[PDB]
Amino acid sequence: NVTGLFKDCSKVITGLHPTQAPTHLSVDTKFKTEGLCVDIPGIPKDMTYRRLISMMGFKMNYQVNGYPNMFITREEAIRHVRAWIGFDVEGCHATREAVGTNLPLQLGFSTGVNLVAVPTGYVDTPNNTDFSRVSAKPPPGDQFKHLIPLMYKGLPWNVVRIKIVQMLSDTLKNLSDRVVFVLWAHGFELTSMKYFVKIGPERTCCLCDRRATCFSTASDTYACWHHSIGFDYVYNPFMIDVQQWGFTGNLQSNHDLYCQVHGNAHVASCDAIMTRCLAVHECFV
Amino acid sequence: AGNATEVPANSTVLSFCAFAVDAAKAYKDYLASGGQPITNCVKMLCTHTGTGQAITVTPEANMDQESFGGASCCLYCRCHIDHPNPKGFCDLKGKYVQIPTTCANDPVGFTLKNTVCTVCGMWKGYGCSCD
Ligand SMILES: CNC(=O)c1ccccc1
Ligand SMILES: [Mg+2]
Ligand SMILES: [Zn+2]
Ligand SMILES: [Zn+2]
Ligand SMILES: [Zn+2]
Ligand SMILES: [Zn+2]
């Protein structure tokens, strides 16, 4: 029994050396015997490998005192309706040196904002994990023909996460002390969040008494939506998956049951708008 | 396509430490809250007639230790996150780590909490002979 979380997406026909494999599963077959591994002097470590590691399959069901839960109940999301931001990501597929994972390409929000990111992955090396640009291809299809030009109009993630924090801060400073991302089939969005979200115990702003919604790696400091200028990370966000509310079909068909003013332009921000719209109609009518 | 590296028993803890600002504190707090230790480490079949040093190029477990592949005992390697040292490189990946048999249930936690004596090469409190 295995998971897709941290799946090795390289095309290397061998596993890893016992000293370099992150897990027993990833050790090369030559080293395995009786449920354990053996060191084989004469079969050396690899010092040049680059192995793309998949960020699909995160499970945020931790129960740790002092750490808030990311996924909240419908009743708690209702109480924080002013914090609702619809969120959707259109991804691209890993290609050439790797195959088997999706990388964020277009991040859409119910504020109408679309951000294009350079296809970046988590690549294991003999020394560390290297967060770097990877070869990617837009999904095989014609409804994703709008993504083909975006493969060259993307920004590095260090800029993208700064723009997300800036947009959320501009939108939510006068509305709420939190953010609640409103999702439909949260899997890929949660994967995308690894690229711009950090978690931990509840903190206060460095400049005021309001709770911290942002974090800066550069200064190791926390800030509210009012003082997050220059901040790169979303800190302790909340979220909910509208798909899990007992809906039979897809996002568009359920949204169109209540609303006729949000046509499908087939962009990430459009799905994010439809998600928040459906959540409002379902929760308050 | 691709090759699975993990088991479902590690999903919660790896996901939690993968998103944390301070992964080390997150893992210790996870254990303190009753969470299970990270499993699926690279445990070695060895003679147990080794030198007993803490971090070695070959398994060096003695009769009181278990040998493991170093990357599998590193929280930062296990979560695919940044390493805390200024150079950003690992000291366990590429080596073998000898863990006391009494602590073999949580190899990741042991390496996070303990230090290697720079004089004798043994773990402080677990084999370090000098003061
Ligand atoms: C040929 N590839 C493998 O044996 C492998 C297995 C698990 C994780 C990474 C690589
Ligand atoms: Mg979408
Ligand atoms: Zn503030
Ligand atoms: Zn609508
Ligand atoms: Zn490491
Ligand atoms: Zn010593």
* Residue B130 maps to a domain: no
Q: CB–CB of A129 and B16 under 8 A? A: no
Cited resolution, angstroms:
2.4
For residues A21 and A27, the answer to whether their CB atoms sit within 8 Å is: yes
Candidates A6, A8, A31, A96: best to mutate against B (most CBs of B within 10 A) is A6
CB A13 near ligand 1, within 6 Å? yes
Domains of chain A: 74-118+135-284 (3.30.420)
Domain that holds residue B60: 8-113
* Residue B118 maps to a domain: no
* Residue B63 maps to a domain: yes
| Method for this entry | X-ray
Could you confirm whether A34 is annotated as catalytic?
no
Determine the 3-state secondary structure of A23 from DSSP. coil
Closest in A22, A61, A215 to B12, CB measured: A61
| Residue having the nearest C-alpha atom to atom 6 of ligand 1 | A26
CB A10 near ligand 1, within 6 Å? no
Give the number of other Cβ atoms within 10 Å of residue A282's Cβ.
Answer: 17
| Domain count for chain B | 1
Closest in A65, A122, A198 to B33, CB measured: A65
Query: How far apart are the C-alpha atoms of B97 and B126, rounded to whole Å?
Result: 13
Distances (CA, A) of B80 to B53, B54, B68: 27, 23, 18
* Residue B18 maps to a domain: yes
Given the residues A8, A90, A124, A232, the one annotated as active site:
A90
**Alpha carbon of A119 to ligand 1 centroid (Å):** 24
Q: In one letter, which amino acid is A199?
A: I
Query: How far apart are the C-alpha atoms of A214 and A197, rounded to whole Å?
Result: 9
* Residue B52 maps to a domain: yes
* Residue B128 maps to a domain: no
CB A14 near ligand 1, within 6 Å? yes
* Residue B62 maps to a domain: yes
Query: How far apart are the C-alpha atoms of A119 and A121, rounded to whole Å?
Result: 7
- Spell out the alpha helix ranges (H) of chain A: 74-79, 157-172, 187-193, 251-255, 268-284
Distant-in-sequence, close-in-space partners of B104: CB < 8 Å, separation ≥ 6: B43, B66
B15: enclosing H helix or E strand: helix B11-19
Instruction: Return the structure tokens found at B105.
Output: 């249930």
Instruction: Return the structure tokens found at A237.
Output: 């966000």
Tell me which residue of A22, A20, A21, A18 sits closest to B44, measured CA to CA.
A18
Query: How far apart are the C-alpha atoms of A180 and A72, rounded to whole Å?
Result: 9
**With an 8 Å Cβ cutoff, is A187 touching chain B?**
no
Query: How far apart are the C-alpha atoms of B123 and B130, rounded to whole Å?
Result: 11
